[PDB]
């Protein structure tokens, strides 16, 4: 149970290998 909703957005640079993180992830320079 993780709460990615709490962010304004999630940087892909921290998703590590979490598959759900990569679904909503946002790529940055």
């Amino acid at each position: 149970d993780f709460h990615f909703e709490v962010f304004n957005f999630v940087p892909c640079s921290i998703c590590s290998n979490n598959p759900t993180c990569w679904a909503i992830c946002k790529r940055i320079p």
Partner: antibody
Amino acid sequence: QLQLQESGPGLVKPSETLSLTCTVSGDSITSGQYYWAWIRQAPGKGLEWIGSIHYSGSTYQNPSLKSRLTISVDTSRDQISMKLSSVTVAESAVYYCAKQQLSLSPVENWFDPWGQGTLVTVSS
Amino acid sequence: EIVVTQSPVTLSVSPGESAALSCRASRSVGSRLAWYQQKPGQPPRLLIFAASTRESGIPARFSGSGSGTDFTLIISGLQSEDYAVYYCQQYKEWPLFTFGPGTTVDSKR
């Protein structure tokens, strides 16, 4: 060596807006995937997280403060800042900034290292 | 949300003795639990994380243990500089976390 340094007002009037700044030295806020957090502690009171921000601009913040809170990040000065508006008596505290670890592979959430803090008194 | 309590409020410890501080979580947090020390006038300093891993720079007389709900910090051979406030922090639901109320270690008369 990594060091965190809070600056801000010493005293502030109620209903006015508190502005603080954390200055990261001996390192770069863009070095690594860390979050940087503001945390305050009223005297004789526990630890109260205010908000965290990452160099991407990504941020999550305390629900009970978001409507008065703003947290920014300046990678060109290695600084993080916050703003509380309509400040009240309940805002008198030491305001800390600390490096945060927000890792998903091995779930990791904590604060190290912390800065000295900067006391903020609120009085008419 | 997950509530961490602590026990006791003030722990009196004579120097050289061994301090056992408790921290109980309302649900299961696994091993996702840190301990902090706050000497008076200073910021918190991280002591333990993942419930037993002692941070680099921390004296080995500080040791953390437990899993699930009930946790423990032990100060074996208490030094004077160790009179401080101790907080625990749980972090099970990433990126959510909660701080404990704090336990104070003071001198024993």
